[PDB]
Design a protein around this ligand. Structure first.
Ligand SMILES: NC(=O)c1ccc[n+]([C@@H]2O[C@H](COP(=O)([O-])OP(=O)(O)OC[C@H]3O[C@@H](n4cnc5c(N)ncnc54)[C@H](O)[C@@H]3O)[C@@H](O)[C@H]2O)c1
Ligand SMILES: NC(=O)c1ccc[n+]([C@@H]2O[C@H](COP(=O)([O-])OP(=O)(O)OC[C@H]3O[C@@H](n4cnc5c(N)ncnc54)[C@H](O)[C@@H]3O)[C@@H](O)[C@H]2O)c1
Lengths: 319, 320
């Protein structure tokens, strides 16, 4: 198994690149992104890290000819909040990079994973335990580009036999990457605020529940789906979930683990109208039955690990 | 009176729509455009307000919009379902990129913009009988895929920027003015030609494959009416519409009534069959009916009468 990763230096890529390196060995894994890893970044100095802009189809093909992958994880995308503000970049990146990856997957017989997202759903999905097949009316361009990713991948599978595999990831929580202005990124902010003992200004409303998953469960699942025999897969795109929580549910969790009250004021920002159009929870029975998707962390296990790791990885005050 | 721009105008839909808009609103208020120039027997040859514009040329597309200042736009170019399976790269280039440019232009210059979708946007999980406006969409062609994209992108432009994006999922459209090509629903137009010529029709769709269809006069009344409707009457951006549903053998019987003779039709399955089979047999268009008055005058025999009489006149095929 020779594994190419594109968009490999962001939140998912960082940890997935290390996980795959450890399992199949550094010589069987090639990691690429349009930027280079910074000095403090976990993949710096390592070899088998390349620069590739996936918008350059010929460059893309060049790397694939040379490395001869049997597997590819295609991760570059502009996500829900950023996309609303830079839609042109969203459409370019999410539509065209994906187009080229699937064309290379067809031509060089690569098994290709491209993640979708709960942002592919909108307010007609059926908000409670959303099924794998339902109405898709996303309210963000990111979401729109991901419905397209899903349909087009599945068409490549039917038409050419391309082994296209995908999951709808819930919001993903990890320690290793600092927090942005993204929709589910408030969770990652509250951990940091609690460690610094500062005011958390949470843009998502206190009782807005969302499906979420902690990264080690995400890594197990992204490898497991791709190791599975094709024969076992009754579909190309699967909901997976970890657990649903609201920001008040997260604040509690963090208080139980720090034995100290933390400071949260809830003032809505752009993430709230977005999150509200998403499902509260997913039905992932198909992923469970077909290829063994499973979850070992609950919200309190995750907080304990997050409150330990953040001080180690970014020097915030330990607990 | 609106100022209407039509892109993709020389094709099957464009030809008859362009003429209708010219009649109704004045030739002065209608600009139409296409990547090629019209050939001399084309109904739009020799007419004013007919330009050459490649919609993949964003700069060029913008320049014409700037000069003309439309208030409405019908953005028609696409690669359709049978051709798209064979030329997928072209389908994705046309169907995605021109659409993107159109919407940006609609936003930027305040255009009410119509972009047709299709029954081909549905697949075999849609609910095959009397399919709803809102249902599972799992199209089994790249065209279908790009049209789901078009539906959702346009909708997002309505929500995010206030763009008055409007659309319908057209069924198989039947018209006489345009010579039939290789597409799925076009077996129907060929069968009218084979009958006037008294030649074999080798049909690549299987005889009992029912599909939603509509006759051009009705589709024209609907295309104009959806665009005249005031925005507050529209409960949604994308509407199903149909005329009536028929299979190849139904169409053959209907031609045989009018000709009072037998046609020869042999069924040899082609690539149109699998595609067509994944589409709805019929659609629920109640929302379109209630919201903006979508209505239908022709049935299959009114349609055959008119096709068999019109094709000779328009194209010199043997009469009656
Ligand atoms: N993190 C989440 O909570 C989450 C949730 C659901 C789905 N996903 C999906 O997982 C994938 C990865 O998400 P992430 O959280 O790692 O995002 P991220 O923004 O953290 O990482 C994205 C990486 O893509 C790179 N990139 C941008 N343009 C590129 C280009 N033209 N060529 C090559 N690389 C380019 C960026 O430099 C960055 O390293 C995306 O498709 C995303 O939609 C993520
Ligand atoms: N005809 C049907 O039964 C049917 C059904 C459903 C939806 N539609 C939609 O209606 C639209 C028009 O269909 P049609 O049947 O008239 O198609 P057609 O193929 O007959 O006509 C297409 C026209 O678009 C033009 N074109 C191609 N590339 C172009 C470009 N880059 N810039 C400008 N023009 C370009 C072609 O020259 C042609 O004149 C399509 O979006 C189609 O999906 C048609």
């Amino acid at each position: 198994p020779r594994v190419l990763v594109t968009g490999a230096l962001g939140q998912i890529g960082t940890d997935l690149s290390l996980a795959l390196r450890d399992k199949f060995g550094a010589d069987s894994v090639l990691v690429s992104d349009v930027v280079e890893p910074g000095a403090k970044h976990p993949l710096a100095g390592l070899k088998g890290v390349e620069k590739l802009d996936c918008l350059d189809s010929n460059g893309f093909e060049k790397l694939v000819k040379e490395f001869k992958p049997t597997w590819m994880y295609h991760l570059p995308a502009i996500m829900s909040v950023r996309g609303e503000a830079e839609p042109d970049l969203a459409m370019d990146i999410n539509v065209n990079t994906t187009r080229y990856a699937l064309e290379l997957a067809r031509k060089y017989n690569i098994r290709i994973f491209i993640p979708s997202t709960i942002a592919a759903f909108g307010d007609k999905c059926g908000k409670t335990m959303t099924k794998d097949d339902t109405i898709m009316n996303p309210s963000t361009v990111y979401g729109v580009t991901k419905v397209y990713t899903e349909l087009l991948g599945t068409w490549y599978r039917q038409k050419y036999g391309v082994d296209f595999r995908s999951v709808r990831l819930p919001g993903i929580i990890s320690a290793a990457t600092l927090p942005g202005g993204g929709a589910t990124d408030y969770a990652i902010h509250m951990y940091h605020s609690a460690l610094l003992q500062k005011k958390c200004v949470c843009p998502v409303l206190p009782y807005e529940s969302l499906p979420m998953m902690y990264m080690p469960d995400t890594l197990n699942s992204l490898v497991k789906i791709m190791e599975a025999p094709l024969e076992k897969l009754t579909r190309t795109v699967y909901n997976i979930t970890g657990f649903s929580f609201s920001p008040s549910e997260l604040r509690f969790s963090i208080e139980r683990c720090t034995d100290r009250t933390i400071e949260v004021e809830y003032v809505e920002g752009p993430a709230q109208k977005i999150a509200n159009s998403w499902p509260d929870s997913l039905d992932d029975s198909n992923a469970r039955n077909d290829w063994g998707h499973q979850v070992k962390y609950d919200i309190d296990m995750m907080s304990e690990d997050m409150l330990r790791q953040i001080p180690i990885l970014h020097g915030l005050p330990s607990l």
